[PDB]
Design a protein around this ligand. Structure first.
Ligand SMILES: CC(C)(O)C(=O)Nc1ccc([N+](=O)[O-])c(C(F)(F)F)c1
Lengths: 7, 242
């Protein structure tokens, strides 16, 4: 995801 | 005094600007584009802030993400409530230095109901004489006030953490016992507002292609994947009072 791809 | 309060002060984010063109007259699209952009920018700051919170790393990672994603609208509303209180005594809504809503903008954004609620939240900071230290500790506990109905991957760690944040709010309060009633009540009231904001944002995402509002990528994603879990009742807030 775009949240877990930057975390 | 505590180590605890030092931390929240130390990690408290700074000024975040929306990037709004205040020289262009107000339109729904422009205002709503600058709020969405602001949203994204503030999300980034909430993430960094969250990860430096005490005991936060104790959580399972996916709980770490989940918790921030679910609670983000609330935390924003809350801090925005304070920013409005401290900077302009709640006469207007201080979304950011370059994005301060007056009633006209309240109406033009089409969020007049929700904005009205938030101005009232701002006023409460005044009415209750909320101190900077009660605000910070309240805000930190907001992050732990909204969870899936079927609990998290490691519920125990979450419960421990939430328990200790309540305690710490209790320490910095101290017939004082009635202070707690009020703050817990004020905290409870953030949820219905965030819920109204969630619906607005959801609905807006859904029509965005057709009202010319631009959604940053991380927004579109959260609003479409996590938010609907809140609006469907899979993810519910934790209320002190019933
Ligand atoms: C997603 C939607 C329209 O952008 C939105 O509610 N954005 C938004 C952005 C910033 C802030 N803020 O406090 O700085 C808030 C709000 F918390 F006030 F409601 C909402």
């Amino acid at each position: 995801t775009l949240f877990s791809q930057h975390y | 005094q505590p180590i605890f309060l030092n931390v929240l002060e130390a990690i408290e984010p700074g000024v975040v600007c929306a990037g709004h063109d205040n020289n262009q007259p107000d339109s729904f699209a422009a205002l709503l584009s600058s709020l969405n952009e602001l949203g994204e920018r503030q999300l980034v700051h909430v993430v960094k802030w969250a990860k430096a919170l005490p005991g936060f790393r104790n959580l399972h990672v996916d709980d770490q993400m989940a918790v921030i994603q679910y609670s983000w609208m609330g935390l924003m509303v809350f801090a925005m409530g304070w920013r409005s209180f401290t900077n302009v005594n709640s006469a207007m809504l201080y979304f950011a230095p370059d994005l301060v809503f007056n009633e006209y903008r309240m109406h033009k954004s089409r969020m007049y109901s929700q904005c009205v609620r938030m101005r009232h939240l701002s006023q409460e900071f005044g009415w209750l004489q909320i101190t900077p230290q009660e605000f910070l500790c309240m805000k930190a506990l907001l992050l732990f006030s909204i969870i899936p109905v079927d609990g998290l991957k490691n519920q125990k760690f979450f419960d421990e953490l939430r328990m200790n944040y309540i305690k710490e709010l209790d320490r910095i309060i101290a017939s004082c016992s009635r202070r707690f009633y009020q703050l817990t009540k004020l905290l409870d009231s953030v949820q219905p507002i965030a819920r109204e904001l969630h619906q607005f944002a959801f609905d807006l995402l859904i029509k965005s292609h057709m009202v010319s509002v631009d959604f940053p990528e991380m927004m579109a994603e959260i609003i479409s994947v996590q938010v609907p879990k809140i609006l469907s009742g899979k993810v519910k807030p934790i209320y002190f009072h019933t």
